[PDB]
Amino acid sequence: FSRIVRDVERLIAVEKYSLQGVVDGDKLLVVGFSEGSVNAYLYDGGETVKLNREPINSVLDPHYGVGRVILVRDVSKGAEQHALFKVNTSRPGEEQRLEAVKPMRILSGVDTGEAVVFTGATEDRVALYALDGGGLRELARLPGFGFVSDIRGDLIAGLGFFGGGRVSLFTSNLSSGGLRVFDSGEGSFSSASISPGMKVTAGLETAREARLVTVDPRDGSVEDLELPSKDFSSYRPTAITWLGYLPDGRLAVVARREGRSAVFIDGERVEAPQGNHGRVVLWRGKLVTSHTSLSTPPRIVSLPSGEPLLEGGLPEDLRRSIAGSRLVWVESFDGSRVPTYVLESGRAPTPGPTVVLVHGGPFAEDSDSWDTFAASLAAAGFHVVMPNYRGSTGYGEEWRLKIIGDPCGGELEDVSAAARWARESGLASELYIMGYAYGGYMTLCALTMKPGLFKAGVAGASVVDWEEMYELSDAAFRNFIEQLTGGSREIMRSRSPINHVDRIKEPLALIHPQNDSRTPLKPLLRLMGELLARGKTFEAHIIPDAGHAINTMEDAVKILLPAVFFLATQRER
Amino acid sequence: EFSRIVRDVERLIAVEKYSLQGVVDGDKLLVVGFSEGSVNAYLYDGGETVKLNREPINSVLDPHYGVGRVILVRDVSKGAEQHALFKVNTSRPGEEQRLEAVKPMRILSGVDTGEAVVFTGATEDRVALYALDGGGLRELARLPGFGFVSDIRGDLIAGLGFFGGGRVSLFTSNLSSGGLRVFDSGEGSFSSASISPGMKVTAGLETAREARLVTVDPRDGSVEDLELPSKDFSSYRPTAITWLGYLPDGRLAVVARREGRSAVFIDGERVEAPQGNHGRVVLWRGKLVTSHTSLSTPPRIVSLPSGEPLLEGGLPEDLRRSIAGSRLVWVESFDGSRVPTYVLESGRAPTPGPTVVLVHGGPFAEDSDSWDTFAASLAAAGFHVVMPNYRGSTGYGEEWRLKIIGDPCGGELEDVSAAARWARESGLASELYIMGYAYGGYMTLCALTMKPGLFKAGVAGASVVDWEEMYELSDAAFRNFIEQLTGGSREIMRSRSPINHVDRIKEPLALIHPQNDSRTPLKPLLRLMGELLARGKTFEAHIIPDAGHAINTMEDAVKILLPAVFFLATQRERR
């Protein structure tokens, strides 16, 4: 119990870095989980220079060598009403609030140096904004979640979750605003970047593969892009993580298959460390990207050598607690094969205690990437099983869109099949389910719809009721709920665990930040009322002055520690 | 270094603790002990203990001397305190037989004579006195409220009853025919009872001033002062009487206290005992034996007069050193009253330093020279601890105790607030917190609603939230107890409930609650959370599974205490 705490504390404390871009001539801009919280840093050598004062949540994407940085900070104690703060790179530590932009949920943004363009959600709308020297302007209204991808001159390109689970491309004008929307009949756009020729290069994920295409925003036309080298085409990428034009004109692309990515410059393979990679930037003539894996916390590395510029050195004893890792393909209820990542604990027997750690989203994936949750479970003596249920990214448009109109249906059958495989393959002596957000939704759905499958369940920041959640949701989240549920109230009611509490038979632990604005605490209080009234065994932990997105190490401990305690308790007994 | 906090709390909780219950199986001590992770019943005969029970229990019934069995009381409702009784033959330890004739109810007390199991129990509809012998179960009498079997000699059953206005009556009944006679004092309340050889009832009588021994005839209701051969007891001038009882050789053992410290007396004569507080006294192989505790000493069984231990859970030395000292101080309250207040200085804090006013529950209880796991763990975590005997407290006379009646969230709160003011002005306290369990948790909520700005933050465990809703969910015993404390008026039940004043809260609050608590139920607490949320208040909450008001595993104790200490350490890091 005391050893558990120090392992959790040390795993959360280890330093983690995302690469954001290039600023102040030729210094890398990094977001860093270091020294207590997410902070923004500069790197040119060399030691790090803290730009921000109090903890932040992210930064807007800078154009190359711009001379300032836009911090995004929650000013609502976790409810994700963000304000924007500008920091001049010459005077690090001094912040100026952008008063023209009122508190809203900031979803993304790019800073061109003259203009701050971003997307934001309020109660009454989702919209695309521009803030320049002549004030703030609303450029266009969006149907739902929308993300600024790139700006070149007056052209703004982006990605829109505007209907049916599909991702559109959208453009606008920096000066006159407006909105054009381009929808593919084959699938969904994953990334975007404006070429020198003012077309929009974009990753197009279709049924069971992916490729590069070129969209003309002037007449909506689209054609396949062929690159100088044939390494990208011959890689057979099933998904595209990110793309972007370097300042020297070359197209950097990161693509993946089976939970592992690969870098490509003008179509040609560039050798990077095994795992997954983030955006790519040009720094002092050399290539630089982020790297992570199941055995490697996020870091900044050079390519092609793979030498680290900013690595949080994980301790060796914590490294040894992960005995191994495999990708396996679990047969589900309908013959589909569910790609599933597996960690064996070195501190567990085989067979042994096993947790099916269900990812959120649901448009996300378990990949060869660092997972603090999974890591701490392995240290605590649990094998970890992580199924990419249908709805997951990274295995094609067909697999991803299968969840639409069918929450608590096909995807739950995949999670259940992963649990059955862990038993039958010989890895699992007992089985638990654990998850955060949509993962926590899956915990609740497993315990109500599939009683007896798991021994116990952990449900964090969970979806409880589609109906009441929609009532408390802003414009962005109302729309996203419509898409996933197909818009029918029959689905919203029947697929909500709050309506099936009488069926629960196994211990349940609930963990929830009090000011969560995505999955709100209110319906969870009602769930507790139901569990109490129906004599069900449950545990609950509500975290103060915190929301869905953790940005301190104190808050991370508060949402992860009770979960590991709870599962170690159930194992003892 | 929250990992160090965990292993201090774990180790403090883990230290074995023992209450003395009686003598059985000829001449073997029967002990209840927090041990091996749970509350269990044991035998002791000079060597290793012998576990009688299988799964964890909550208590045992008082055995007559040398009886050849033991009656375990076990919650069979995952903490809601619907108990069933299990009999264990002392020859075959580990084999239990359920007493099916007694349906699940809240078991409040009981004595086993060997032929008959007599007990008090509360159900939804009533509180009553029962007898279970070889010819089945009988209801002997119905009680107005909480009632406790004190002693049985032959056909006579004597006991104590909280039957009206905060006062404690004496009641009798007959084992064979039942019935009920009730005797009330015009001077005060009876605290303990035992039937003499002469079939009268010897009883402690706590008045406004001193406490003293009296002799009640149950046949005509008459009273008189009991004079003893030795006058150490009279000259001790006790302000309260903890326990009394006749030993098998006829001598009257009495434990009496003043200013939070007790003393043993055999036939009026002082018998030396370790400094602190003592439980019941028994005669074991010709020698005297009682329980002992103190602020530096977890409950243990010791011999007298030497004070040598038969069953001590050794409190580690490093944990001992974490308590730098202790005082009794007298805090001036809002009306000139003096509030006797126990104080622990932490060796791991500065002076002035972070300080927690740890408010006891009951409210008919007291902070005394006695082991307190909460207070101890706070000191280890680097907080000074201040523990005020607010009005309503036991141990300082009937007048002080009855002042709370009809006035919850009133005078008593002013005492707790005065203790906080004293910790500041005296120089002990750089910052102030409030923490409490049950009525203590009620006081946390009342301090943060009615006295915003006094404390920096508050911890509220198993707390009273709403007198009105609690009454609706309460069984017969608790409905009556609520009527007594609030004077029965609906205006007091509403106005003195913190749920009606949530808009006034400004400081961080941590709520901790066992889910199946049947004394202070979870339901109104869920509503409290609904109010805190809707009014934008900062709060934290921890609900514990398959647990109730009375903790009986070490896992459950950790879940109820660990989040509190973490929370206060977090607020201290906040400066």
Swiss-Prot record, chain B:
One of its GO terms (cellular component) is cytoplasm. One of its GO terms (biological process) is proteolysis. GO terms for molecular function: omega peptidase activity; serine-type endopeptidase activity. Its EC number is 3.4.19.1. The active site is at residues 438, 517, 549. Gene3D superfamilies: alpha/beta hydrolase (3.40.50.1820), Peptidase/esterase 'gauge' domain (2.130.10.150). InterPro entries: AB_hydrolase_fold (IPR029058), APH-like_N (IPR054035), Peptidase_S9_cat (IPR001375). It is found in: Cytoplasm. Keywords: Cytoplasm, Hydrolase. It catalyses: Cleavage of an N-acetyl or N-formyl amino acid from the N-terminus of a polypeptide. Signal peptide: none annotated. It comes from the Archaea. Its main location: cytoplasm. It is an enzyme of class 3 (hydrolase). Pfam families: APH-like_N, Peptidase_S9. Belongs to the peptidase S9C family. This enzyme catalyzes the hydrolysis of the N-terminal peptide bond of an N-acetylated peptide to generate an N-acetylated amino acid and a peptide with a free N-terminus. This is Acylamino-acid-releasing enzyme. It comes from Aeropyrum pernix (strain ATCC 700893 / DSM 11879 / JCM 9820 / NBRC 100138 / K1).
